[model samples]
Target: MREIVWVHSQRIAPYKTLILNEFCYYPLELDPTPFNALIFTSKNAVFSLLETLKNSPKLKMLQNIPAYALSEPTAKTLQDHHFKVAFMGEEIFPLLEKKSVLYLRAKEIVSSLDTILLEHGIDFKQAVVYENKLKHLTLSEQNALKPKEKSILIFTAISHAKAFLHYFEFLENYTAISIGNTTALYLQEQGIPSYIAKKPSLEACLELALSLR
Candidate 1:
């Protein structure tokens, strides 16, 4: 039987983790006064910012704004915290108006949304409230996939792909599924061919991972 491994910071259902990286949330310093809209691309971003707002009463203003999320999970994360999610899809950049928007994200982001903000002249500020601490796969984690003749490796972000290369030295006989475009391009540069997910979501990547040969 084949194995399916998820190389992510956190775990999801029906897959064992290789534990590529861990998320560390930092103290975000920003007043929620100016921004009329909010952008959340990762659940980590939602969690980190919510922690910051926990100490501030200005969460009322933040919750009052139109929150846009890159995926449904991210939207759900914000929605769970009483944010009114205005948009819930990949096509968020196109819906922006010349209003003040704050994008809460990790320290390392592969998305070119910042440049898009510049291109559109959208007044947006980025708050990096968390970062990834890359980790090496444990011996037992390695042994799980090493004994298998074929396996599926799921990469949720570009940093996870870097962690995989650092651990493996060379690409092995495995099916790879990338969360989206930039990650797939990064993997392709290292001669790793992966089935790119239709959307940048765990469920989207899992669907591609489970269906592949």
Candidate 2:
């Protein structure tokens, strides 16, 4: 199936290309000067980096450094820009010689990366690269809520899960697909039997949704 456009609002405008190479978050507060390695779990984090460092003098400290991501998509986005990705993981965490890692991510998080860091006895820091704010949806998001619509909700973060549950009363037949276990737990607490993806990807969500029918 083709990729579905379930846009919540206008896309975050692409950062000006001049600053694209310097990716950092806007209104940047944290400095990576004290850190050795950087960690990202999503491509959004790359955007955060670009926005933060666009006019930042602290960027000098990040000139030559290794970065790690949780998936190929995150790594590839950076690599496509000629940025070095030291590690990418599906299950295993990377062994960074830097001795510490800073996880740049959304304010809302649920993952085992921090546990892995502790297990390795590595010092780690987490910076909120972006905040997840609800944007107004177009008529399209409302049109998808019909009672007869055989929609399969795909939720990756608790934010989307809660947002959906709060905003709309799902059809009785609307099968919901949670992107992973943590999301499944959220749905379960609400007395919803969530269809879980075998792999946490948009493709897996689609596969499970089709299979549910």
| Top candidate, metric TM-score | 1
lDDT of 2 by residue, 68-173 (tens): 7777788787776545567444343536644567777766555657677778777788777776655355567555533246555566656666666665676676
Off by over 4 Å in 2: 1-26, 55-63, 87-94, 97-100, 136-150, 211-213
> Tens digits of per-residue lDDT for model 1 on 1-213?
567788887777666776667778886678878887888778887777677668566666777889988777888888899887885443566677767899887787557678878888788998888888775567877665442447788888788889878776444778888998788899999898888888888888877776764
Whole-model lDDT, candidate 1? 0.78
lDDT (Cα, 0-100) at 25 in candidate 1: 83
Q: Single out the weakest 10-residue window by summed lDDT for candidate 1.
A: 141-150
| Minimal lDDT window, size 10, model 2 | 15-24
CA deviation > 4 Å runs, candidate 1: 58-60, 86-98, 136-149, 179-181, 195-213
Which residue pairs overlap in candidate 2's backbone? Answer: 23-49, 23-50, 24-48, 24-49, 24-50, 24-51, 24-52, 24-53, 25-48, 25-52
Q: For model 1, what is the error of residue 17's alpha carbon versus the real structure, in angstroms, after optimal superposition?
A: 1.9
TM-score of each: 0.74, 0.68
Candidate 1: residue pairs that collide: none
